[PDB]
């Protein structure tokens, strides 16, 4: 099989800048090369076919070039909608083979997280279960830590976290951390806290609720 | 306008086979190859093969020879892909695409012995201007699940997080930031659908 390889798995760039993704084939593919764009939701769409011809509809800031085993895809005027993974594919020989992709990360102004804590649903309390949900929404950059506390002490077990993909609209990241316990263990305690420590401040953002309150 | 519509996600037991459909419209069906691709999270896209509707001519990637069977039906302008002798390494997203590169939306296939579990949907009301609300979509199986807010009405300000798998069950939550004037005053809901279990549930977020 022809191995298609991309120079990197990811690339970062600022809005308005231009980027170039790169591929080299394991054998000459005589310009039989396509470039695709896969958005987070999973939709795929052709950008450049046969090395440099752009698909009808695709903007001209997109361009492709190269020959032999070496090919390039360039994007000028980066914009948020360009957040995605780009991959090359050769259709010179069977089986067709794809490159593993290069995620495009877009740089942007630092933004603190908007944090929300939610106690279990009464409806879940009945099912015998209780999840404490916490949302660290819309921040930049990527890195962020959440610390959970019950009756004031750090709690770690039962904590599962989940990150979204860079937002195609505002270029931020979001994350939800869920602390799950049993109903019994949840009534056994009184105070719940979610602390997010992020690049944007030394004092973490703390959100909490006390079952005695409202 | 060219469109490729694939059939929804599938849950199959090991050993059976499945047939995925790719319904096309907007271009002459048999005058172009229909290809199929496999994307398994982790790996990259692998080419399975292609068929030419006109005559049923097929070219297969030797690695899917036997696993996959391609057929087309000009009468309905629909291509099919049968994967058989299924095991968990066949679990993945499958795409149909033309040579002229137009792609289907992808079909999610889960091969597993575990049984279907519909999700338990719980509202998340807080305990300012805008206010954030959420829905906890818990203990379901297999993926995917569709979370909407007010039947697709609420759109901007939504965050539906990637499910996390545990004890053979999936869990995710979705958050939504709206205004003080809408909620609680009005009814606000999160619509959750889970195909494998034929279930759809809306949940209104009412103040605690």
Domain that holds residue A123: 109-211
Q: Domain total for chain A?
A: 2
> Biggest alpha carbon distance in chain A?
72
Based on the fold, state whether residues B88 and B22 are members of the same structural domain.
Answer: yes
Based on the fold, state whether residues B197 and B120 are members of the same structural domain.
Answer: yes
Q: How far apart are CA A80 and CA A66, in angstroms?
A: 26
Based on the fold, state whether residues A88 and A151 are members of the same structural domain.
Answer: no
Secondary structure (3-state) at A198: coil
Resolution for the entry shown, Å: 2.2
Based on the fold, state whether residues A95 and A134 are members of the same structural domain.
Answer: no
Using the Cβ of A32 and the Cβ atoms of chain B, whether some distance falls under 8 Å is answered with no
Q: How was this structure determined?
A: X-ray
Please name which of B119, B134, B122 lies closest in space to residue B171, comparing C-alpha atoms.
B119
**Chosen domain end from A50, A77, A108:** A108
Domain that holds residue B93: 1-113
Based on the fold, state whether residues A162 and A189 are members of the same structural domain.
Answer: yes
| Cβ(B173)–Cβ(B124) below 8 Å | yes
**Chosen domain end from B113, B145, B161:** B113
CA distance A134 to chain B (A): 10
Q: What is the CATH number of the domain that holds B188?
A: 2.60.40.10
**Chosen domain end from B85, B113, B141:** B113
**Chosen domain end from A46, A81, A108:** A108
Is there a contact between B127 and A214 if contact means CB atoms under 8 Å apart? Answer: yes
**Chosen domain end from A78, A108, A138:** A108
Q: List strands edge to edge, sheet with A70-75.
A: A5-6, A19-24, A70-75, A62-67
Based on the fold, state whether residues B199 and B179 are members of the same structural domain.
Answer: yes
CB contacts, 8 Å: A178 with chain B: 136, 171, 173
CB contacts, 8 Å: A193 with chain B: none
Q: What is the CATH number of the domain that holds A147?
A: 2.60.40.10
Based on the fold, state whether residues A85 and A1 are members of the same structural domain.
Answer: yes
CB contacts, 8 Å: A95 with chain B: 47, 49, 61-63
Q: Domain total for chain B?
A: 2
Q: How far apart are CA A52 and CA A64, in angstroms?
A: 4
Q: What are phi and psi of B122, to 5 degrees?
A: -125, 135
Task: Give the one of A49, A89, A124 whose C-beta lies nearest to B122's C-beta.
Answer: A124
């Amino acid at each position: 099989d022809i191995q298609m390889t991309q120079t990197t798995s990811s690339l970062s760039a600022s809005l308005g800048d231009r980027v170039t993704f790169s591929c080299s084939a394991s054998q000459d593919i005589s310009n039989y090369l396509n470039w695709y764009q896969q958005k987070p939701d999973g939709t795929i769409k052709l950008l450049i076919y046969y090395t440099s011809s752009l698909r009808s509809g695709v903007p001209s800031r997109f361009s492709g070039s190269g020959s032999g085993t070496d090919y390039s895809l360039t994007i000028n005027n980066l914009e948020p909608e360009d957040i995605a993974t780009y991959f090359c594919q050769q259709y010179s020989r069977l089986p067709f083979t794809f490159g593993s992709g290069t995620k495009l990360e877009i740089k942007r102004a630092d933004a603190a997280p908007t944090v929300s804590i939610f106690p279990p649903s009464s409806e879940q309390l009945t099912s015998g279960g209780a999840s404490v949900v916490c949302f660290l929404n819309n921040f930049y950059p990527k890195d962020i830590n959440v610390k959970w506390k019950i009756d004031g002490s750090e709690r770690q077990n039962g904590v599962l976290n989940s990150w979204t993909d860079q937002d195609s609209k505002d270029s931020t990241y979001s994350m939800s951390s869920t602390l799950t316990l049993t109903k019994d263990e949840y009534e056994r305690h009184n105070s719940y806290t979610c602390e997010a420590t992020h690049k944007t401040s030394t004092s973490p953002i703390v959100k909490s609720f006390n079952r005695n309150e409202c | 306008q060219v469109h490729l519509q694939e059939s929804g996600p599938e849950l199959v037991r090991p050993g059976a086979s499945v047939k995925i459909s790719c319904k096309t419209s907007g271009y002459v069906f048999s005058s172009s190859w229909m290809n199929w691709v496999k994307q398994r999270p982790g790996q990259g896209l692998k080419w399975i093969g292609r068929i030419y509707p006109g005559n049923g001519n097929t070219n297969y990637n030797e690695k899917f020879k036997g696993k996959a069977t391609l057929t087309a039906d000009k009468s309905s302008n629909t291509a099919y892909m049968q994967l058989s002798s299924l095991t968990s390494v066949d679990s993945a997203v499958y795409f149909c695409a033309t040579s002229s590169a137009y792609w289907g939306q992808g079909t999610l296939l889960t091969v597993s012995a575990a049984k279907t579990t519909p999700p338990s949907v719980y509202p998340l009301a807080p305990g300012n201007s805008m206010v954030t609300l959420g829905c906890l979509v818990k203990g379901y199986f297999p993926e995917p699940v569709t979370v909407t807010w007010n039947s697709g009405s609420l759109s901007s300000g939504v965050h539906t997080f990637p499910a996390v798998l545990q004890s053979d069950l999936y869990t995710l939550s979705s958050s939504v930031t709206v205004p003080s004037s809408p909620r609680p005053s009005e009814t606000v809901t999160c619509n959750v659908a889970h195909p494998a279990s034929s279930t759809k549930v809306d949940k209104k977020i009412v103040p605690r």
